């Protein structure tokens, strides 16, 4: 055999296949690591940037509204529904079976002062914003896929699985809210 | 290497799992060693080595 580039092992020597596979696996480690690194670098370049994450927390104060009405206030893209429910509205929202509710929740565990309801106005189905004083439950109707919410912001019929999200609100005085 | 061959190279599924494990563990080990070299080469220059850190009036 030509021996300028390679020198043979003595004839009858055991094959070097195992050593060869062992050696090749070392570089295979590196190839797999490199591929993983490059793909994950592209996937994570699509994730939220630092300037975006720097704007994900704040607080805003508010006042008072007349009964029977609803005001849509702002934050960082999640509007907040605030409604002053009348006594008849409170009574209507306290005469329903808990078992029939898709998401079992009580009126009291969703309200601090029974004269006000502060919820995030984003449909739990797919992110749309429900219409006030619409639907067949006196609360909110979502125009996207027909999700229906009641006085307490609870889902009754439609595709949305959960009730309206309740943020952290409080009353510093008679006419001052804060989120 | 024939003993290791009889456990890792007999089936391609085991061999592929071995390559994945080698990538994981070897990259972790190299990362650790590189970070050790970096720390040993930059003693005193880290943010955590600022004498007055926390002491801005």
């Amino acid at each position: 055999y030509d021996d300028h580039n390679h020198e043979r092992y003595p004839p009858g020597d055991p094959s070097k296949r195992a050593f060869a596979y062992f050696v090749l696996s070392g570089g295979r480690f590196v190839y797999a690591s490199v591929l993983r690194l490059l793909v994950l670098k592209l996937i994570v370049s699509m994730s939220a940037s630092k300037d975006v994450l720097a704007l994900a927390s704040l607080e805003v104060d508010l006042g008072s509204i007349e009964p029977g009405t609803t005001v849509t206030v702002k934050w960082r893209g999640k509007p907040v529904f605030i409604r002053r429910r009348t006594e008849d509205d409170i009574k209507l929202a306290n005469s329903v079976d808990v078992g029939s509710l898709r998401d079992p929740q009580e009126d009291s565990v969703r309200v601090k002062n029974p004269e006000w309801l502060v919820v995030v106005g984003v449909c739990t189905h797919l992110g749309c914003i429900p219409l006030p004083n619409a639907g067949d439950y006196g609360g909110w109707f979502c125009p996207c896929h027909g999700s229906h919410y009641d006085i307490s912001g609870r889902i009754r019929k439609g595709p949305a699985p959960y009730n309206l999200e309740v943020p952290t609100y409080s009353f510093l005085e008679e006419n001052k809210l804060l989120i | 290497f024939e003993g290791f061959y009889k456990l890792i190279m007999r089936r391609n599924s085991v061999y592929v799992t071995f390559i994945i494990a080698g990538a994981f563990f070897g990259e972790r080990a190299v990362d650790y060693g590189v970070h050790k070299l970096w720390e040993r080469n930059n003693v005193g220059k880290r943010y955590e080595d600022i004498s007055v850190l926390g002491q801005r009036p």
Partner: peptide, 28 residues
């Protein structure tokens, strides 16, 4: 009775690869 063993081996390989790409140690 080798296709089942091949399926088990490749399932182990797929699991190992999953834990390796996503590395969910802070979630488990």
């Amino acid at each position: 009775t080798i296709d089942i063993q091949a399926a088990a081996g490749w399932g182990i390989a797929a699991a190992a690869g999953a834990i390796w790409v996503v590395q969910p140690f802070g979630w488990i």
